Design a protein around this ligand. Structure first.
Ligand SMILES: [Mg+2]
Length: 713
DNA sequence: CACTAATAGATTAGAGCCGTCACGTATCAA
DNA sequence: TGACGGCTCTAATCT
DNA sequence: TTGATACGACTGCCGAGATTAGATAAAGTG
């Protein structure tokens, strides 16, 4: 099969002539910063259809006004207002993307909506679900800001709004339009409750990416809200777009579905070794946690099966060493953090974060997650991660590569990985270029060199690689640019650049909406209509004995209930009759109903299917986005190996594969190796790692240097 | 008994967060 | 100092 | 006779109106 994935990039073509015929456009220059008040007064006076913000590095405008009927253009000092034509829209650097922004700004969150005029430059969507109150009854919504950037990528960033009682003439004031379910700018004092951007409370606000619990829950997520808005826009503004707004479709090239290992198989490296559990002296709170953890580890079957000796001493011994300390990083206190010596491997854990101690408790309350067939305390994710970090620190200190299996190490040896860190607190722009090389004996060969961006004419390998990365980066002046780049994998003269981006993977939201509509619980059904439909669909079943038997049982079950019923009644009747969706026969019936019937008891979303709408969120693959004409930009994604849970909190970002040196075949020949390195368990607990695993070694090695060189911290 | 007065945005850049490290159950291979 | 990694507020940059 | 691999993880209801007698109970001045 061929998997299809769609990113945040949009495909659309605005029907320019119809838009020009139905509207008049105005461009507002703002020269004087004090003239913002006059501009706000003008906006309060007028009533435009939509407003977007033209702003570029070569400024020829500051706002675009979409007017159904152009008003009398006035003359105000500090503003230049002049009606333009869409054929001359290139004169003010108005690309065919602020027009889609206007049409987006006219939209609404509600299903089956129309083009309602609006004056807010940005589309901020918030309902009643994304709302909470404080002890001062400060209403604090948080919306979902939608915006199409200069490269036609949709951004869905979360915007949080707080409540203010009185109008602020110097700050921006926002008012919640409850009917349209979206925030709006307030230019004049208005009845209602005012809002301002910001979130100063302790807890953050996260909007779920997508949820498959049901259609109602799906509509209150990033993907669901985006789908609602896109479908609305594709419907009400049918004339204005020659082609509908759809996310750009792309083909996966190198799909990798390597299964991970059980997280608790890391104790094999610890076989026939010792763990010296000890804590910070004269601190009872850490001592009891250390004692409890040591006792759990001793009694654990996995520890006792692998022949691992766990002892609770009072000081650091040779070999592995887990330390328990009070976190004194923030305020002033004695530093219980002990730095490891020559042959000692230390891995500290605090009490506040690891032991889950909030300020006030008299004693520890840490309880390892022992869920499973037989309860075992050496299987918790935190303990496994501690052991994995101990194994990695052992590799770093010993200089040998021994925690990566023996077959993956052979495939990784002939490749060299560079690491970059923009050296802050340096007058001259300087970057530290680390380089990890592997000897044929699987030995680490870290070797760095400080490189100045001004003096890039040197001919060493570090200077060459830094110069090549320097050219590719958009804004090398800042440090976030150098933070975006992960590593530069090198194979001889070939060099490949891995860089993080902001474009994420979007699932096929339309198909998810269509299926969840079929599986909608409160969907009323007609007994006669459903019976007739199932009778007509009977010939198409043609499966095995149990499948057809379950289909006939469901067909005969429908007649039992009342002439009309919600789908929940049918679902409960099937469940009581023994049609558990987990069964093999009922699953095929559910799939058949999803593909062909107007209803389905269970939806085949979490199932692994040849063409799933959840493509790109589950496996590792490589994509080739056009990004214009002939550049053939290459990207890849990393998804969760396990089956997706009903909710997915975070999207999956797209890294970039830019060949600094060599031809285009560098990607096609090195990507399988990178994917093989990315299928590891120690770097990321229970998941794939987005970047190759030697990036973890480089990051740990650089942190070790930072521990001794405050000049680079 | 008393107020008047009369008020940068927009867009990135980064520190630091949470939150996810999957679990109990039917089910085909070996 | 479980740690990775997306990403959210917020100080910074930029007129 | 058990060690895999693919998928389940279920939230309720949804106002108006009309009739009584019932110790109490502080601390003020423009
Ligand atoms: Mg660490």
């Amino acid at each position: 099969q061929q998997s299809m994935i769609r990113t945040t990039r949009l495909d659309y073509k605005i029907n320019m002539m119809q838009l020009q015929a139905d509207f008049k456009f105005l461009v507002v220059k703002i020269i004087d910063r004090s003239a913002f008040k006059d501009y706000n007064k003008l906006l309060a006076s007028w009533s435009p259809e939509a407003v977007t913000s033209i702003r570029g590095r070569y400024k020829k405008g500051d706002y675009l006004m979409m007017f159904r009927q152009l008003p009398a253009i006035p003359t105000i000092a500090g503003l230049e207002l002049h009606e333009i034509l869409l054929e001359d829209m290139g004169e003010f650097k108005i690309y065919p993307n602020h027009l889609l922004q206007l049409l987006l700004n006219q939209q609404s969150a509600n299903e089956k909506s129309l083009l309602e005029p609006c004056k807010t430059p940005e589309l901020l969507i918030s309902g009643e679900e994304w709302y909470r109150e404080f002890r001062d009854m400060r209403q604090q919504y948080y919306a979902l800001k939608l915006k199409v950037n200069w490269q036609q990528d949709l951004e869905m960033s979360v915007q949080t709004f707080t409540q203010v009682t009185e109008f602020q003439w110097d700050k921006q004031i926002y008012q919640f339009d409850e009917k349209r379910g979206r925030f709006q700018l307030c230019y004049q004092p208005s009845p209602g409750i005012y809002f301002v951007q910001g979130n100063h409370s302790a807890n953050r606000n996260y909007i779920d990416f997508l949820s498959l619990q049901n259609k109602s829950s799906f509509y209150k997520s990033k993907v669901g809200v985006v789908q609602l808005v896109l479908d609305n826009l594709n419907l009400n503004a049918e004339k204005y777009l020659l082609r509908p707004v759809t996310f750009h479709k792309s083909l996966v090239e190198h799909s990798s579905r390597l299964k991970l290992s059980k997280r608790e198989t890391i104790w094999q490296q610890l076989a026939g070794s010792s763990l010296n559990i000890y804590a910070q002296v004269n601190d009872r709170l850490s001592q009891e946690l250390a004692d409890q953890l040591a006792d759990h580890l001793i009694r654990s079957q996995l520890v006792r099966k692998n022949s691992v000796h766990v002892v609770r001493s009072q000081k650091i011994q040779s070999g592995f060493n887990i330390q328990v300390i009070r976190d004194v990083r923030g305020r002033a206190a004695e530093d219980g953090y002990e730095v490891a010596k020559n042959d000692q491997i230390v891995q500290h854990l605090t009490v506040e974060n690891f032991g889950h101690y909030q300020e006030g408790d008299k004693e520890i309350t840490w309880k390892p997650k022992v869920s499973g067939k037989h309860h075992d305390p050496a299987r918790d994710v935190a303990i496994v991660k501690l052991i994995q970090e101990l194994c990695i620190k052992r590799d770093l200190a010993n200089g040998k590569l021994k925690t990566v299996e023996p077959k993956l190490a052979s495939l990784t040896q002939p490749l060299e990985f560079y690491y970059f860190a923009f050296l802050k607190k340096s007058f001259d722009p300087e970057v530290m270029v680390i380089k990890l090389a592997f000897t044929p004996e699987m030995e680490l060969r870290f070797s760095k060199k400080k490189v100045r961006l001004n003096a890039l004419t040197s001919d060493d390998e570090y200077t060459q690689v830094c110069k090549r990365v320097f050219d590719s980066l958009a804004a090398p002046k800042f440090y976030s640019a150098w933070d975006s780049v992960d590593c530069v994998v090198r194979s001889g003269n070939k060099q490949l650049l891995i860089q993080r981006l902001n474009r994420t993977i979007m699932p096929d939201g339309k198909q998810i909406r269509k299926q969840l509509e079929l599986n909608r619980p409160d969907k009323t059904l007609w007994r006669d209509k459903v019976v007739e439909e199932l009778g007509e669909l009977r010939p198409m079943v043609s499966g095995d004995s149990d499948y057809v038997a379950a289909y006939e049982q469901l067909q005969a079950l429908v007649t039992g209930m009342r002439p009309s019923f919600p789908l929940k009644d049918l679902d409960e009747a099937a469940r009581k009759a023994g049609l558990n969706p987990k069964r093999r026969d009922m699953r095929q019936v559910n799939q058949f109903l999803t593909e062909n019937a107007t209803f389905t008891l269970k939806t085949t979303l979490q199932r692994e299917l040849p063409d799933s709408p959840l493509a790109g969120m589950k496996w590792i693959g490589l994509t080739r986005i056009e990004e214009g004409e002939g550049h053939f930009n290459t990207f890849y994604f990393v998804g969760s190996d396990k089956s997706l849970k009903p909710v997915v909190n975070r999207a999956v970002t797209l890294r970039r594969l830019l060949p600094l040196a060599g031809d285009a075949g560098i990607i096609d020949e090195l990507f399988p190796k990178l994917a093989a390195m990315m299928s590891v368990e120690f770097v990321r607990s229970g998941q794939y790692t987005v970047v190759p695993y030697p990036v973890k070694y480089l990051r740990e090695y650089w942190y070790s240097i930072l521990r001794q060189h405050p000049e680079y911290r």
